[PDB]
Amino acid sequence: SMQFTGKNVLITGASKGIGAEIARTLASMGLKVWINYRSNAEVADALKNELEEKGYKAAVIKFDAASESDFVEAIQAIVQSDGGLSYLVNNAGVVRDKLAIKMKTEDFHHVIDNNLTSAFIGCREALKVMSKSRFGSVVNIASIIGERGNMGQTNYSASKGGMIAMSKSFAYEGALRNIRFNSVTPGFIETDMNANLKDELKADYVKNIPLNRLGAAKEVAEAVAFLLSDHSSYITGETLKVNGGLYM
Amino acid sequence: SMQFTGKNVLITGASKGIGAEIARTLASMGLKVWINYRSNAEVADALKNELEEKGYKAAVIKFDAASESDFVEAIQAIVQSDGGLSYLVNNAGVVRDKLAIKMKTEDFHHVIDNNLTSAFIGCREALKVMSKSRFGSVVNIASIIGERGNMGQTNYSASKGGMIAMSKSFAYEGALRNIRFNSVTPGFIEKADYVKNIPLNRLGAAKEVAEAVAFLLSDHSSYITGETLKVNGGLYM
Amino acid sequence: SMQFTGKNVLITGASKGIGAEIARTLASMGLKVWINYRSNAEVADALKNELEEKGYKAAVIKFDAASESDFVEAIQAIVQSDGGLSYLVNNAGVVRDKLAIKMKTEDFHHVIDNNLTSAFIGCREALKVMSKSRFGSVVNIASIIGERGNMGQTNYSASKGGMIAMSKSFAYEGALRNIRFNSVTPGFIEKADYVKNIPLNRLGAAKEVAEAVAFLLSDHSSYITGETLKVNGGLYM
Amino acid sequence: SMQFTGKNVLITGASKGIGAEIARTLASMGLKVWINYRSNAEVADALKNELEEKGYKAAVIKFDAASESDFVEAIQAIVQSDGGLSYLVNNAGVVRDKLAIKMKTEDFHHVIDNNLTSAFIGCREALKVMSKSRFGSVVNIASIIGERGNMGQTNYSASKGGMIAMSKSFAYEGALRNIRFNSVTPGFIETDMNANLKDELKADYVKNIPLNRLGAAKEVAEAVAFLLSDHSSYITGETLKVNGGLYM
Amino acid sequence: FEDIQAVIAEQLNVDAAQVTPEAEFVKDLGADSLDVVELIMALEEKFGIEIPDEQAEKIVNVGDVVKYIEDNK
Amino acid sequence: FEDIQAVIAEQLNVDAAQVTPEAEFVKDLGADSLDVVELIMALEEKFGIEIPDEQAEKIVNVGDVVKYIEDNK
Ligand SMILES: NC(=O)c1ccc[n+]([C@@H]2O[C@H](COP(=O)([O-])OP(=O)(O)OC[C@H]3O[C@@H](n4cnc5c(N)ncnc54)[C@H](OP(=O)(O)O)[C@@H]3O)[C@@H](O)[C@H]2O)c1
Ligand SMILES: NC(=O)c1ccc[n+]([C@@H]2O[C@H](COP(=O)([O-])OP(=O)(O)OC[C@H]3O[C@@H](n4cnc5c(N)ncnc54)[C@H](OP(=O)(O)O)[C@@H]3O)[C@@H](O)[C@H]2O)c1
């Protein structure tokens, strides 16, 4: 485990993937996790039922993280039920890869709006509900390619890079009320988002990763847990690389 | 002066300030500068006159860098007039500072759509027109804020951090074509108590930014792509 | 607490300050801490007693971390006693600040040989003993100075910037062996006017550094190698 | 060309390689270049004679850059002849690659002493002879692998990384007298230092370099020239990547 | 088809014999991708108007290129 | 030699038939480098004392390993 002074956590896009495994990990450390989903609740409720049967406190909550009014009401309901929100994790993310010349301002905005704007609302509402309680930790799931860039991901990289720079400024804004903002920039994780991909391009990656494997969603998750826990109490505006050596 | 293989350049938001001073600089090195403006012609043509008056080549052009059709069509007009396009500087930027809790999603979008999306259409048309000639250089004007962040600038930090990471990805995409992509991050350019954080003990002058940009478009930086060049007097190392 | 696959750990320069507080922390999580000291036993055994008194395991050991034979032989002694070695923290450091023009080559070397070369023998013996077990974690304690520099610390900035880049290279070398290498860069740890540059408006406490180190040695960071983890209250983002 | 307010420049290890091409470039921009060599003057004098025959002002000067007394006297003689030194370039560098377990504290120190200490003396003596004249630019040739690390180069990376952090501090120290320190971190340049290397490992690199070629020593050189020239007058404590996209 | 043969063969440094109708652009004629996007765009410089992504996705070998053109004529 | 065969074959997951005297460690038996450094060091765990770098440089295939050992015995 790891100590937490807080009690509950909101994890946008937590139904599947790294978001799921963040919820399992924070739950099994005795936090109350609010699994967010946007569309089909059959996977989110299944996760919630997996976690309660293990004896952890869990819940599900429906909103589009890119929708301001839908996001703000969501947290308000979390505060109303629990009397405050201690930990936010902006995990919600989409990917749409295209060579720039075939890419369209819809495809740029689709990623910006879902990957960047959602995180802004999160961090913002995170200041609001946490300022008076003089405590808080937020973690924005970014990506290696916000630090490095990548071919065919001019929209995804634009959004992850904004998220890392934006998180730095929030950390300035919330630092005096002991509200810390950090980012996690994972390498290539064995999840839903990149599962469908050419083996010619996948073993291509493995041979560039010094640790010689794709990372586990549980491994991004426990790094997010450290950054939210109290062990990280002097760490703010940092970016934690979880990429097995793929970029240093 | 500095060696340029290319002939012309497009400078978004160049009617005043740092954009004007990149146009002034880049013209004095022999390029035909395509100044654009969004609103006031009067001052934009003043600049075109000031440059043409020193015996440089210079042209104005009117489009909103956030508007896809206006800017795509612009570049198409410049290609059709001058034969092609060699250099582009995504200089167009806005600022609307606020603490986060006082900031509405409109206040975020106004900066993202106008600092980052504009840089996107720019770079994307750069790739489109410079590929057949296999040659080009693009420079995106960011800020120290895209590297450090800043209190009251979560919307701007977002758009400049975007622009930096987006630029690196374009740099991957156009290398297949000897089309280089790089960013410049200026610090404080010309209260005055903020000078104590700068090691050079002064506010950098816009010409100091224009020459950095000129170096990144020039042939000297012909092996530099994907880089971010800090012009900040040492404020952030 | 935190999950550790390994049993023991060696902490260079651990008799006092941040080193003592890494020993105290890492022991309270169940590891056998091998404190070392270079000179004063008295205070080093005080710490060994304080830990053993709370029912933790703990051992002192005497060697100069700059002295190749002393430290190679140390680790050989710890292997021979405890069967092997799992974790190492290169914490040994010195400081001798001066303006550059007042600084003699001896004043440079005293810091390089004692902050960076020590980290070298450490990491190098880490690779030597942890390979057969295919498991380990090494943490080098750097500083915000190795990232930002600082006036009057060209010798220290050199040794901490070295240690960071050296650590990344060791991380490449031992990945072939599931041996992770990472750095921690603490900011100001506990005049007081320097607190105005820290966003958290306070000097970090050494336990806040020890737990960062513990996280980098623990199994949670099992996909983190080559990273640099800033523990600086936001002084440098 | 490019404007320079200064007149002469000292370039440690300038006889061959990138150091040579720095000297050609700064010379052909009308600077007086002091080509340093450590051992055999047949290549340094040949370079000096190449440059004067072109009509540029050049010279040669013998010292081991890692030798403090030998370095300090060298600059003193440069000041005595020319009445001051405007521009220093710490180019002098050695490489010795070994897996860490086969590496020896001699091999660590050989690189540290030659790559790092030499640069310290340079920057230091650079403050001295430039402080009273309220002008100066210094450029330390580092390397990509001071930023990234690399397998088998724990000694080289240690030294390049120190050089980049050390240059930052000098830039603090000399900033008020308008003395600027910058580093150039090149990628893989087609010179003497890496010429002898397996084609299996060389084409390995090329396919990782987005610009799809090894850089030219002339290309590191013109980037050093920009950083010394006046066009860079607001740039200090920066690190300029000249690696064709190999690292971003 | 003959002028389609010469276009893709100029477009990526291969002679017309390479262009058998069902030689693939990537497994056979040896091309990255921008190569195929810029070829398709180059093929829309024949004014086959803006043939859709939903029909270009299925382009892999030169014969599909003869389709989709003579479709969108 | 027989025990030399079994050592390198354990040392890098290959059976003894692979070990023909002039099979190379890298072109034949399939090994990176630490693999060969750690093998040589493992072979000095036979107490062939610290055979020099200047004689190990020339080790490429298993027969040289039979040399340099029986030299430094
Ligand atoms: N996996 C990697 O290799 C990698 C590496 C870097 C970091 N990450 C980051 O990790 C996060 C996602 O995890 P994953 O890679 O495992 O992807 P995934 O399996 O696709 O999970 C992403 C989840 O986010 C949800 N989501 C998206 N937009 C949302 C919104 N507006 N409101 C609420 N939920 C929303 C999803 O949407 P649906 O309704 O569409 O299911 C889905 O449940 C992202 O931030 C991604 O960019 C990925
Ligand atoms: N100077 C600094 O301290 C600092 C810091 C970092 C770098 N820079 C960057 O420098 C750039 C401009 O320099 P500046 O500070 O001198 O700013 P400025 O004084 O506001 O000049 C910016 C220019 O961009 C124009 N512009 C804005 N949006 C545009 C659009 N969509 N299309 C076309 N033109 C547009 C301006 O607006 P109007 O037509 O409304 O006048 C003006 O001509 C920006 O990208 C800024 O982010 C500034």
Ligand SMILES: NC(=O)c1ccc[n+]([C@@H]2O[C@H](COP(=O)([O-])OP(=O)(O)OC[C@H]3O[C@@H](n4cnc5c(N)ncnc54)[C@H](OP(=O)(O)O)[C@@H]3O)[C@@H](O)[C@H]2O)c1
């Ligand atoms: N606290 C800060 O503000 C700050 C900033 C960044 C991080 N750190 C880092 O923290 C580490 C130590 O923390 P500290 O600041 O609390 O320093 P400290 O108070 O000086 O403790 C440093 C320890 O290292 C020992 N030591 C030095 N050289 C040694 C050697 N060759 N072999 C063995 N032990 C040796 C010390 O010397 P003695 O035996 O002489 O006592 C002492 O036990 C250093 O690497 C420092 O660079 C400090």
Ligand SMILES: NC(=O)c1ccc[n+]([C@@H]2O[C@H](COP(=O)([O-])OP(=O)(O)OC[C@H]3O[C@@H](n4cnc5c(N)ncnc54)[C@H](OP(=O)(O)O)[C@@H]3O)[C@@H](O)[C@H]2O)c1
């Ligand atoms: N080439 C690359 O791929 C690459 C990439 C990163 C940057 N660089 C850096 O570029 C510099 C060298 O250029 P190069 O790669 O072209 O190497 P090179 O051809 O080997 O040239 C290096 C020169 O430095 C001299 N030198 C070394 N130590 C010296 C000392 N103490 N005093 C005076 N001169 C000394 C040499 O010594 P001799 O007497 O032995 O000739 C030689 O003339 C170094 O800082 C290197 O680390 C190299």
